[PDB]
Design a protein around this ligand. Structure first.
Ligand SMILES: O=C(O)CCCCCOc1ccccc1CN(C(=O)c1ccc(-c2cccnc2)cc1)C1CC1
Ligand SMILES: CCCCCCCO[C@@H]1O[C@H](CO)[C@@H](O)[C@H](O)[C@H]1O
Length: 262
């Protein structure tokens, strides 16, 4: 009965802390938010114009693939910051000891990052710089290995995910469900976390039958997506290890070194 209130507070935490909603993202991608459109980045020259000021600091320069890799890090570290504030706005999360909070964010943020990335992605590319840019998938494909191999799987997941047609209120509960996961290694108060997760799942199962009355099997499809996200992030972490090993001139932000340390 109270699930509607617990879930409303999660929605508010979502709207207060995340830079862009799926709502705002889809209106830009479809040309319904402004009479100015995102600047399309599809090669070195458009990339250079975007950096020069059209659209928008980092470690010293090295090459274009690496440059784009540093822009991906900057966006992930920033999204880690929004996920930390989102999580702390969930009272039951803030009741956990600080070390359990860190353990859940450490192993959950990338799963949650890649779930939210679908919102800014279509089959042809994705938005950057708060919607001022659009970077083409074909450009990101043209990057040299291993940087194109770490990017392209996220588009595959994103286009299938977007076929579920979730709105921001669905996503807020789904993200909370990914972060409050009782399985993370070294978790201290596991029973307390599992109870929170279960509450969010029940809130989510209720929310879907109200918001998507005609979509059947959506809840078990979303549970499957959470299992798919765990595997996508396992493969992402393996690809990050190879970059650490073979791309020695490429630096990793220190906060990402901590997440990938284990
Ligand atoms: O392991 C880590 O934590 C760091 C390593 C991540 C490496 C893989 O990152 C991927 C993969 C697929 C899709 C999106 C991203 C990065 N993201 C971007 O929004 C993003 C930002 C800027 C550009 C960009 C800017 C300028 C010119 N060209 C491209 C493109 C994409 C989302 C945060 C995930
Ligand atoms: C900002 C929230 C995201 C934080 C994710 C980074 C977690 O790094 C971990 O921080 C712990 C210190 O508490 C260390 O003990 C671990 O060795 C380290 O892996």
């Amino acid at each position: 009965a109270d699930l509607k209130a617990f879930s409303k507070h999660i929605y508010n935490a979502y709207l207060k802390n995340f830079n862009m909603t799926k709502k705002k993202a889809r209106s830009i991608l479809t040309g319904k938010a402004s009479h100015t459109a995102p600047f399309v980045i599809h090669d070195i020259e458009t990339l250079w114009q975007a950096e020069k000021g059209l659209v928008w600091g980092l470690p010293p320069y090295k090459e274009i693939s690496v440059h784009v890799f540093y822009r991906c890090q900057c966006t992930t570290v920033e999204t880690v910051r929004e996920l930390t504030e989102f999580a702390k706005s969930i009272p039951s999360f803030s009741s956990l000891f600080l070390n359990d909070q860190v353990t859940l964010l450490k192993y959950g943020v990338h799963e949650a990052i890649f779930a939210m990335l679908a919102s800014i992605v279509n089959k042809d590319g994705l938005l950057v710089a708060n919607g001022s840019g659009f970077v083409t998938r074909e450009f990101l494909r043209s990057l040299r290995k291993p940087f194109s191999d770490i990017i392209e799987p996220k588009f595959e997941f994103a286009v299938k995910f977007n076929a579920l047609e979730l709105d921001d209120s669905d996503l807020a509960l789904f993200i909370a469900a990914i972060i409050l996961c009782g399985d993370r290694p070294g978790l201290m108060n596991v029973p307390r976390v599992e109870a929170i997760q279960d509450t969010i799942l029940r809130a989510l199962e209720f929310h879907l039958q109200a918001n998507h009355p005609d979509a059947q099997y959506l809840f078990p499809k979303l549970l499957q997506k959470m299992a798919d996200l765990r595997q996508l992030v396992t493969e992402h972490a393996q690809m990050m290890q190879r970059i650490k090993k073979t791309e020695t001139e490429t630096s990793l932000h220190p906060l990402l070194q901590e997440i990938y340390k284990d």
